[PDB]
Amino acid sequence: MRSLKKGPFIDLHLLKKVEKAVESGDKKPLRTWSRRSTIFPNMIGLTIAVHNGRQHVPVFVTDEMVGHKLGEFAPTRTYR
Amino acid sequence: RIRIRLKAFDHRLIDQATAEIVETAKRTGAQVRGPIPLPTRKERFTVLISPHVNKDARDQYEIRTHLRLVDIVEPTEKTVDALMRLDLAAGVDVQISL
Amino acid sequence: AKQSMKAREVKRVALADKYFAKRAELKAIISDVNASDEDRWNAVLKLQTLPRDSSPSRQRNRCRQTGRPHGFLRKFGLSRIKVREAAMRGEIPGLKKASW
Amino acid sequence: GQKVHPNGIRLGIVKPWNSTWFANTKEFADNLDSDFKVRQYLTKELAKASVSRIVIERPAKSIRVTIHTARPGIVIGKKGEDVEKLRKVVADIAGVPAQINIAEVRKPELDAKLVADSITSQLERRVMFRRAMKRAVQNAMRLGAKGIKVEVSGRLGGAEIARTEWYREGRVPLHTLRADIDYNTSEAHTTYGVIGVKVWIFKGEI
Amino acid sequence: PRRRVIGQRKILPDPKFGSELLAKFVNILMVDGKKSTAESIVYSALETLAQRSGKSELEAFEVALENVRPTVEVKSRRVGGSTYQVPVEVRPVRRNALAMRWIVEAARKRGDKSMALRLANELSDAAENKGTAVKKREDVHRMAEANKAFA
Amino acid sequence: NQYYGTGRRKSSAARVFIKPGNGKIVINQRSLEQYFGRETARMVVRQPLELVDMVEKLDLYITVKGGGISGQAGAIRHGITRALMEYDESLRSELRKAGFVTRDARQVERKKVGLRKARRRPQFSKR
RNA sequence: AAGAACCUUACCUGGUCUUGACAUCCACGGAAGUUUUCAGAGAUGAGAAUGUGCCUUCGGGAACCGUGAGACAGGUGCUGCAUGGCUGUCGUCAGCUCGUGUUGUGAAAUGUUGGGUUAAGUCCCGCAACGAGCGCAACCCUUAUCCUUUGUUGCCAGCGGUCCGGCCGGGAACUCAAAGGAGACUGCCAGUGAUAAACUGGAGGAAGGUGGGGAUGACGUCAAGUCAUCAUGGCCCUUACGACCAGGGCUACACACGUGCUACAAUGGCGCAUACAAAGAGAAGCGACCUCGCGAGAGCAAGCGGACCUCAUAAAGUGCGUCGUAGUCCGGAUUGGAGUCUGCAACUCGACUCCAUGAAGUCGGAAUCGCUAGUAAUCGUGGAUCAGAAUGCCACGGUGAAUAC
Ligand SMILES: [Mg+2]
Ligand SMILES: [Mg+2]
Ligand SMILES: [Mg+2]
Ligand SMILES: [Mg+2]
Ligand SMILES: [Mg+2]
Ligand SMILES: [Mg+2]
Ligand SMILES: [Mg+2]
Ligand SMILES: [Mg+2]
Ligand SMILES: [Mg+2]
Ligand SMILES: [Mg+2]
Ligand SMILES: [Mg+2]
Ligand SMILES: [Mg+2]
Ligand SMILES: [Mg+2]
Ligand SMILES: [Mg+2]
């Protein structure tokens, strides 16, 4: 999926989960363990929560964050 | 018109099979090309010697694959009948192409 | 080597010949320039529904006598130490000491 | 530590191979596996038959296992009522049709595996190892041999610290490649630990 | 070494002049084991040496060498709290192969453009008894007189 | 009709045929000047011939296989001396007096386990 | 560790299971197997349609599941200072010992010291020592030359036809392939030597003094390393320290050390054109040809489990042109953007390609390493591991030194 010939990637569990959310709009933050999935423009305005390894941190979506994969916005290792 | 190539892991054993095959061909009466030695293949391996560190100490192995070819030219109807399962040797590959 | 891990390898073998010898079209057939509608998008989506055990990506290829993960040798199927223990004794035919 | 397998450096010089079959790179790792599965069972099934050497060959998809022993009557029994029971499970283990024939070793005290077998059975039965390994050296030599060396290491006699003790009598040249030396090893799982046994027997020089 | 005395190897002569002395010169000048470019420089600087001054190409070499061969060099031996450099005469076989090393090394510090131009300039300087190679030869000679009280 | 020599210097085996006539040399269906180019590769071929001064007397047909530049050029020098060995007999003592007859058996040696290149160990630091 | 994105993973977080993920038993009921649906991050949980392998057990045993209870399974958990097995090392150094005899009250000694010589307790002569074993050497592999046998998928000296491509008939000579032999032994000569071992040279020879390399590592030392290749004595957890799964970490960074690659340029950079290798690999593999794309690569797609088919155009070099000593047409890090291929999945954390940017670096303090000949130096190709991923490891060849008083 890291090629235009294949197409942008999102997991099936996340894809069906976000579809239900937009059917009713913004709601309680979405907890997900998926970090390998790109960010689609269908979930702009949500506060999905990615799991960095120990906790779920809420990442706020924005038009700018529409080509970056989900895990980019959860620092997995702490430092100072 | 039929090629018999023989592969083995030791030259002395491969000679036992190629020697009878010309004898059988001579027993057919004449017209054998004579075994020809193709180049030998040798795979060399290098495995570590210890269960642990001391990487610098290794053992080097090698397996050879000796080759022969007799190139039977005249296919008598009694040549084909008699050239099955008469190698009298275990561990020697046989391959016949028509 | 830790019989638990040995049981994983044959569980991943069983699910490797079960699916990815027949369910390979999604990743091979429906990947190229053809009908570009959602059927390809279905193929990408449907490939994840199969269990995580894919054919190549999850086979550690460990030794056959001890299950040692490292030092494997594809030709003999044993580790680098069992090869010298299935040894120069004579277990492996035609394998002697090399000196060139 | 600093010595090579005497039976191994002489694989192509004087000592023969214990497995003589051919297979290309595709059918090697599984031919080897079925070899190990046959050897593992035959040693376990013939534990008290004093089996010396098992040589396996595969002529044309038909395994042929030849067992060398100094007690052939125990193996086959009364007109081969047990050898077939052994053959009937080798095919199961290997997946190919088998033919097991037996060769008698008429020198039970002059085989490396047999000697190292007898003096590790004794240790498990708790005889003092000095008596055990002094016997094997004399029994082999009075039976005709140009040299023998027996080595026993481990927690000998229950001592808290390990120790190695080797008795060499005669003439045993290890560097001379042409020498016909028989070497083998065994173990003893005593109530104190593990004891290792080695034995070199030098019989000929050509 | 300490046990086995041994002779020297045989050197193939150069392809343009057939002199072994210049056959060693292409060997000393060569780096990375590429005689092809090593010999390309030598003849290029040898040709422009003949036309600039002197006669021939194998003769302007031998005149230059006469002004860079050291007669006496100092070898150091350790005695006590310091070392004394005791002079000793140099055998001819070492003398030739030593002057050439000085010539090349001094001609690698020249400010000219390419090695072809540097080598010829230094060789012409040697025949005129000037340069940096003859600078070293005088110094090795001078050190002998300074320590000739330690002979 | 023809006389022959092999030459086998450093993994390059040649084969030379010596024909009485004028002086012309063809090697591997090419002229001597254009095949080698190196001044140390077109005189080392000539070295056996100039020593006996035949040079302009012999017509040479040559095929060389394997090796490199100086390996092949050295191999030819061996074969030519072996070719001259055949159709004249009293010439051995002088030809051997300048080499050209010794095979010069110096090949590339193994890499060796534990050694970085073939004899060079890796840098050894005590601490 | 001959190759951590998931896996490996043995670690952490979270979610779960218990005679269990792995093996032998007892009883109960079901042929197994197949497709699909729902909930879940996933293990799993709830299903819905699909099914029959020998008979004298046919009413149950033998293959495969679900369940129960108990025997037990399981541990990469501790002790390498309880062990086996396997290694490093002094050390490829020439030494380490024994039987009988003799000397000494005795621990011990002599043999093994002494004159030469040797790479070597190698060899000769002396000698209260006489012999023997483990070591040295030799037997072994490869390389250097010649002879005999065979001639494909290798070869082309001499013949004919050539789209001068071994291309085609055709030949067994040649290079080569692989089987078997010949050769090198201080064999011969002169001199020195205690007339001896041997040494220095001379001839012939492809090879001259163990021709070059490899394999081979004595008695033992460091109670050296490994309980995490494996096995094993004890000790311990055994609804747990066992087992399953999703995500993360093993790639973190004020610093320090080790082994390497790239350079700091003119015996070089770039552009065009063009010679010469060896060894090795290949079946969910190597992948020509042609087309497409600036390129990584994509498409159709022959050939080959192989002296023929693919990898695969070798590079340093040579000929021509430019750059004229500049942080430069040297250097290629770092960074922004655009992509390709494996792979469920490329953010943490892959390789590679296109455009732009252009850092430190202008020969490196004390100190310190390797190398004696096809060696160092320098240039490229291959293989193992491997879906993808080496400047490391292992192996091959091309060019090819200086110096040893
Ligand atoms: Mg091959
Ligand atoms: Mg993998
Ligand atoms: Mg060893
Ligand atoms: Mg090299
Ligand atoms: Mg220890
Ligand atoms: Mg310790
Ligand atoms: Mg420790
Ligand atoms: Mg003593
Ligand atoms: Mg000795
Ligand atoms: Mg030896
Ligand atoms: Mg996991
Ligand atoms: Mg690490
Ligand atoms: Mg600067
Ligand atoms: Mg790879």
CA-to-CA separations, F74 to C41, C71, D187, E133, F91, in angstroms, rounded: 67, 45, 61, 37, 20
Strands (E), E22-131: 72-78, 83-89
Torsion-angle region of residue E77: left (phi > 0), alpha (psi -120 to 50) or beta? beta
Strands (E), B1-98: 3-8, 41-48, 58-69, 93-97
Q: Give the list of residues 6+ apart from residue A21 with CB closer than 8 angstroms, or none.
A: A27, A30, A43, A46
Strand pairing report for D147-154 and D163-170 = antiparallel
Resolution in A: 3.3
The Cα–Cα gap between D23 and B6 comes to 12
CATH of the domain spanning D16-106: 3.30.300.20
Q: Is B61 helix (H, G, I), strand (E, B) or coil?
A: strand
The Cα–Cα gap between D28 and D19 comes to 12
Chains that touch F (3 or more CB pairs under 8 A): B, E
Show me where the domains of chain D are located: 16-106, 107-206
Determine contact: B97 vs chain F, CB below 8 A.
no
User: Which helix (H) or strand (E) element contains residue D186?
Assistant: strand D180-189
**CA C86 / ligand 4 centre spacing (Å):** 36
Residue A59 burial (CB count, 10 A)? 21
User: C-alpha angle D25/D28/D29, rounded to 5°?
Assistant: 115
The CATH number that applies at residue B31 is: 3.30.70.600
Q: Which CATH number fits domain D107-206: 3.40.640.10, 3.40.190.10, 3.30.1140.32, 3.40.50.720?
A: 3.30.1140.32
Q: Give the list of residues 6+ apart from residue D166 with CB closer than 8 angstroms, or none.
A: D149, D150, D151, D152
**Total domain count, chain B:** 1
Question: Is the distance from CB of F56 to CB of F86 less than 8 angstroms?
Answer: no
The Cα–Cα gap between E1 and D198 comes to 46
Give chain G positions with protein CB within 7 A.
1-10, 12-13, 21-22, 34, 40-43, 74-76, 82-91, 119, 132-146, 149-153, 156-158, 165, 174-180, 204-207, 211-220, 223-226, 228-234, 242-250, 252-253, 258-260, 266-268, 275-278, 280-284, 298-300, 305-307, 314-319, 324-325, 339-348, 350-351, 368-378, 384-387, 393-405
The Cα–Cα gap between C59 and D75 comes to 42
Domain that holds residue B54: 1-98
Q: Is E134 helix (H, G, I), strand (E, B) or coil?
A: helix
Residue C50 in any domain: the answer is: yes
Taking only Cα atoms into account, the Rg of chain D, rounded to an integer number of angstroms, comes to 18
Residue C100 in any domain: the answer is: no
The Cα–Cα gap between E107 and E99 comes to 12
Taking only Cα atoms into account, the Rg of chain A, rounded to an integer number of angstroms, comes to 13
Residue C32 in any domain: the answer is: yes
Residue C66 in any domain: the answer is: yes
**Total domain count, chain C:** 1
Residue D138 burial (CB count, 10 A)? 13
Rounded to a whole number, what is the distance in Å from the CA of F14 to chain B's nearest CA? 21
The Cα–Cα gap between F6 and F83 comes to 8
Residue C33 in any domain: the answer is: yes
Domain that holds residue C9: 1-90
The Cα–Cα gap between C61 and C71 comes to 10
DSSP state, E14?
P
